[PDB]
Amino acid sequence: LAEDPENLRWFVQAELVNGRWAMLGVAGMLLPEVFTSIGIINVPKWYAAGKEEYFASSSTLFVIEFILSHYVEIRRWQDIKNPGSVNQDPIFKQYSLPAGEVGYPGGIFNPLNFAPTLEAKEKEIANGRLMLAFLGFIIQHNVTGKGPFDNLLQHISDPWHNTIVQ
Template sequence: MQLTHFNASAKAGVSRASSRRTTVRVQAAAARPSWFPGNKLPEHLDGTLVGDFGFDPLGLGVDKDKLRWYQQAELVHARFAMLGAAGILVPDLFHQIGAGGPAAQIPWYDHAKFEYYAPINALFGVQVLLFAWAELRRLQDIRNPGSVNQDPIFSQYRCVCACV
């Protein structure tokens, strides 16, 4: 909406009219989007998180520390999902170009039939131990930011990849 005022002198012989222009702009504030229109948004979700549409039916985000933990867990799970999708697509692409070795010759849904270099239970156990180590390091860095910047094997070195 635009509102404009013009004031001009009505006297004869005045060559210059004085004018005043005022612009008024009215804009309605956008309502915060909700996952369910008409739903009352929870107070603890204030819209500061990316993708916050007020969905928390169980009230899991009331505690701010737990909400931060859930946010980090969601990021990690999204990254693992992307790695899983790449783990399906890349071997199939390698198979199409004739590379990738014997594992690329088997479709992703038949990899249980592949003969690995070690018993599958041993590989699973090693994977669980490695993931537990990585998750404990991540938890340590969340509780004490910057503490994982130290090289775990050689204490005189610092990891250059950590952002503090």
């Protein structure tokens, strides 16, 4: 019987988690970029480490890291239903305990607050979308080629290309 604007703790959290991981992902590229250096999916096996052991399959490195990742991840689902994180930085974020205004249900637009400091992460929000939908682009453009820019005496024009196969 209750009309609108339900959502709550809800999935404001989901997006922001997308923004924060999108930003990190982009950093995972980032890397070559000035010394053109290394490229693309790479499928790397990541940084290395330096060799005595491997040849390297060496087991499933991910499967393991990821079992651990997995009870950090629960910790967060927990918090979100009923909350405890000492910093308390997504759920509201810091400046913490309030967000009371969300906690008892029903806000409808609300902007929000955070940190003992100030400048309300509305500036992290942006730096954060761009990185959302930046993967979007980045992932899209593979299918074809690695690299962007720098110079024209020839490069900018996009004089001849592949298409999609049909």
